[PDB]
Write a protein that binds this ligand. Sequence first.
Ligand SMILES: Cc1[nH]nc2c1[C@](c1cc(-c3cccc(CCC(=O)O)c3)cc(C(F)(F)F)c1)(C(C)C)C(C#N)=C(N)O2
Ligand SMILES: Cc1[nH]nc2c1[C@](c1cc(-c3cccc(CCC(=O)O)c3)cc(C(F)(F)F)c1)(C(C)C)C(C#N)=C(N)O2
Ligand SMILES: Cc1ncc(COP(=O)(O)O)c(CNCC(=O)O)c1O
Ligand SMILES: Cc1ncc(COP(=O)(O)O)c(CNCC(=O)O)c1O
Ligand SMILES: [Cl-]
Lengths: 442, 442
Amino acid sequence: MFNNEPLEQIDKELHDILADEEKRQRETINLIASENLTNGAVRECLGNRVSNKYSEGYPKKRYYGGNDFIDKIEELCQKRALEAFNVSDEEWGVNVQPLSGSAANVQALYALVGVKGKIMGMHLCSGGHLTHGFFDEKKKVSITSDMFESKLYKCNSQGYVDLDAVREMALSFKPKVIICGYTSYPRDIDYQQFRQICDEVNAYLFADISHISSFVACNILNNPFLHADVVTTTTHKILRGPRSALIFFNKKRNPGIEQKINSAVFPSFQGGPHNNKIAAVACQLKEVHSPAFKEYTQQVLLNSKALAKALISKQIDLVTNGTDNHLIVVDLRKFSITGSKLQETCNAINVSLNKNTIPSDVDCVSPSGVRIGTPAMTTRGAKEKDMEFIADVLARAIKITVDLQEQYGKKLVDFKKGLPGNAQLQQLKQEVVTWAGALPFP
Amino acid sequence: MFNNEPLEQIDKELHDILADEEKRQRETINLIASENLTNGAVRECLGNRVSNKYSEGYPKKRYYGGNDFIDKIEELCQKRALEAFNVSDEEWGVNVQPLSGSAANVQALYALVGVKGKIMGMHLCSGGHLTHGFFDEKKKVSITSDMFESKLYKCNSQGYVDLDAVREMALSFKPKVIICGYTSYPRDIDYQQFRQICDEVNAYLFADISHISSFVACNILNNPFLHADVVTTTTHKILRGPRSALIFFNKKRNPGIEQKINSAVFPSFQGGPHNNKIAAVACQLKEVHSPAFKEYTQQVLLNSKALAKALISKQIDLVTNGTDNHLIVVDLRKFSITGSKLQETCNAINVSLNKNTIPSDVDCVSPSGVRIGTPAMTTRGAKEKDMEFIADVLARAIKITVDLQEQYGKKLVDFKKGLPGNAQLQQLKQEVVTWAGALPFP
Ligand SMILES: Cc1[nH]nc2c1[C@](c1cc(-c3cccc(CCC(=O)O)c3)cc(C(F)(F)F)c1)(C(C)C)C(C#N)=C(N)O2
Ligand SMILES: Cc1[nH]nc2c1[C@](c1cc(-c3cccc(CCC(=O)O)c3)cc(C(F)(F)F)c1)(C(C)C)C(C#N)=C(N)O2
Ligand SMILES: Cc1ncc(COP(=O)(O)O)c(CNCC(=O)O)c1O
Ligand SMILES: Cc1ncc(COP(=O)(O)O)c(CNCC(=O)O)c1O
Ligand SMILES: [Cl-]
C-alpha cells in the first residue's frame, strides 16, 4: 500500500527545482573550499534501502537483531577508515556513526572533557571552526562555548598560528583539550609543537582535519596521527565522500578512550545511525586508498599552487602569501571592496566562493576577503593550465566589483542594484558557463 | 578526474552485502514500531546531487550564495510541513534542518531552557525516549540528563501516564519544560491536561510525536498543536519519510521563539544542512497530505487493533490491555521468558521486533516484553485478516522459546545454542520467508 511512481511522476514541482539545481552545478566555477562532487556509486549508496533499518548501538552489541548485514557494512567502513589513514586497528579506533562534522566535534569534545570542561581552539575569524569553542561578546554562538568553557587563540598579523600565544594561553587557562586543524587556514600544521604544549599542561590533542583529510591520508602533508589523541574529519569535503563524519581515537595513549567516545556518540547524543551514510562512506573510503585518488589529491595541491601563483601574477594579495594545501584566502583591502560584494558579483557570474575574514578584521561584521579552493574543479578535470583562466575570471570580477561600487556606492543594498542587467557580468557569466558546462561532471 | 563506474563494478564487496540486506528486508515480518519502507521517489532524493551544496544558515539569509534552488527546496519543505500538520504559517513555524530525532530534541530543549536548565520527561523504562532526560543512578546516560537537570516521571502499575504524579513532580521540581509523547507508549496522550499542568508551574509544553506523527497529521488521534509550545518529530517512522526531523514552534504563544529555535539548530549545534534529506522530506510530505496516505494511516490503526485482539484471543497479555495507536507492548511474564530471548527467537525466524520494558520491571536489566507495530507491514500491504497469521507466528515463537528454555536453561548464553539447527524454527522461518517474500516491496 504505497506509491511507487518515479520522482518525475510523483512530484513534478520538486523534480524541476532539482533538475535546475543540477544545471547550476554543471554551469558553475565552484571554488567553495569545502565542496566537492560525489560519483554515482556514492549516490547509489545514499539512496539504498539500508536507511530503512534501525540499528542503535554498535556492531555485535546492537539493541535490535536483524542487523547482520548492517554489522558487516559498519565493520567494513571502520576497517576501510583505518587503512585509509595509515593506522593500526591495534593502536587506533574509529566511530563511523556521527551524522556530520559538527556533531562529531561536540561528541568527541564531550567524551574528553564533559560539561563545564575547558577547551582551546582557533578563533572563528582566524580560521577556526564554530565547533572549536566559538563565542562573541554578544553571545555564546556555538554550544562548544556554552556546554564547555572555551578560550580562543588568534593567528598573528601575517595569518600564521602564533604558537607562543597558544602556550601563553594554555599555561594560564589549563584546558583539558586544545583543538588544532581549521576551516580556512591556508598552511600546514605543526602538530608536534601542539603535542609538546599539550603534555606541558596535560591536555588532550584534538586534530580536526576535515579540510585537509585527503592530504593526511595520502601523506602529502603532516600526519597528526603521530601526535594526536583524537582526530575528527568530515567525509564530504576534499575526501569526496557523503555528508558524514569520523572520530578517531588513540587507544594506546589513552586506555579507556574507546568506550567514552563510543558512548558519547550513542546514547549520549545520537540515536539510530544512518546506514545509507555509512554504506556511502565505505564506498568512498575504498577509492581513498587507491593510488588513483592520490593522483587526484596531488592535482588538488598542484592546482592550488598554480592558482595562488597566477593570482599573485595579477597583483592580487593572498593571506600568508601562498598556500600549502587546497585553499587560498584572498585579501581584498587594496581594492577597497568587501568579501560579501565579490561573493554577490561572483554568484552573478556563476562563480561559487565565500566571504572570509582576514587578520586585519577585528570583527566578523565585514570580512575583507574571500576564500577559494581547488577540490571541486580538480574533480571536474581542471589542470594547472586551467588556473590562469580562473584567476583571470576572478580578477575581472574584482574589477567589475570596483566599477559597480564607484557607480552605485559602497552600501550593500545600493551596490546590489547595480548587479542585475550589467553588460559585463552577463558577458563574463556566458564565458564562465561555456567553459564550466563542457567539463566532466560526475 | 573521478571514477564513474556503477556501484556493482567499483565495489563488488559492499554491493553484495547490500543485495543481501535487500533480500533480508524482503523476507522478514518487520514489526519494529519505529521502522517503515521508503518508496523509490524518496530514495531518488536521498541520492540527489543536492547533497553537494554547502548552505549554512537559513533561506534568503545563507552564508553563501549559489543557493537559489536550495532555498526553494527548503522553503517548499517548511510550507509542505505546516500544511501537513494543519497549522497556519502565521501561528506556527518549523525548522527542517535537524539531522535526526535526537538532534532535534537536544536542540529544541536547549533553545527553551539553556545549559543547567530544568526538564521533565517520561522515564526510559516507562516508554519515554533517551532524549527526554534519561539517566540511571550509575550514569547520566543521555546528554539531556547532563547538559540539563532532568527529573523522570513514571507510568502507573497498569502502564498509563500517571498525571497526579506528573503534577506532584512539577510543583516540587519546577522545570522550564515538560516533555510528553513517547517511544513505547501504546495509548493516546491527554495534552490538554499536560497544557493545564504547564501553565500552573509556568513551564513550556514539549510534544515529541515521532511515533504517532501520521496520526496527528491525519486527525485520527489527539492534536498536540492545540496545546503545545514545541512539537518535534522524526520523518522516518510512521510518517514514512527519510531519516530526518522537524521542530515545530508556536509563535503566538511565545514571541521570539522562532529565532531561539533557529539559532539552536544552527550555528549552536549543526553546521551545513543535508539538502538531500530536505528534498526527500519535501517529497514525502506531498504524499502525507493526500487522501491516499490517510487511507494508509487508518489501515495502520486497523491492523494494530486486529493484532492486539488476535494476541488476546491466544491468551497473550498486552500492556494497557490494548492500543490506541500503531504499537503494542506484549507482557511475557505468564510464560517466564524474557524479551531478549524472544527477540533472538524471532530474529531466528525472520521476525523483526524489539525487547521492551514493562511497568513491573523496576530495573531495565531484564525487559519482560517485546514491542511490536504495524506501519512497516501495513506499507507492504497486510490487511486486518493478515494479523491472525502474525499473531499465530508470534504465539509459536513464544512457545518454541519456552521449549528451548526448558532444554538449555534460562541463562542467556545457554539459551542461544538451542537456536541454530532447530527444526521447528527452520520450519517456522520457511513459513515466514514464503509469506513475506510475496508481499509488495517498495
Ligand atoms: C559559515 C562558517 N562555518 N564555519 C566557519 C564559517 C566561516 C564564517 C562564519 C561566519 C559566522 C557564522 C555563524 C555565526 C557567526 C557569528 C556572527 C554573526 O552572528 O553574524 C559568524 C561568518 C563569516 C563571515 F564573517 F565571513 F561572514 C564566515 C566561513 C568558512 C564561511 C569562517 C570564517 N571566516 C570560519 N572560520 O568557519
Ligand atoms: C534503544 C532505544 N532508544 N530509545 C528507546 C529505546 C528502548 C530501549 C533502550 C535501552 C537502553 C539504551 C541505551 C542505554 C540504556 C541504559 C542501560 C544500560 O546501560 O545497560 C538502555 C534498553 C532497552 C531494553 F531494556 F529493553 F533493552 C530498551 C527501546 C525502544 C529499544 C526503550 C525502551 N524500553 C525506550 N523507551 O526508548
Ligand atoms: C574544520 C571543520 N570542522 C567541522 C566542520 C563541520 O562540518 P558539518 O558542516 O558537516 O557540520 C567544518 C565545516 N566548515 C564549513 C566550510 O568550510 O565551508 C569545518 O571546516
Ligand atoms: C519519541 C522519539 N523521539 C526521538 C527519537 C530519535 O530518533 P533518531 O533515532 O532519528 O535520533 C526516537 C527513536 N526511538 C527508537 C525506536 O522507537 O525504535 C523516538 O522514539
Ligand atoms: Cl542522508
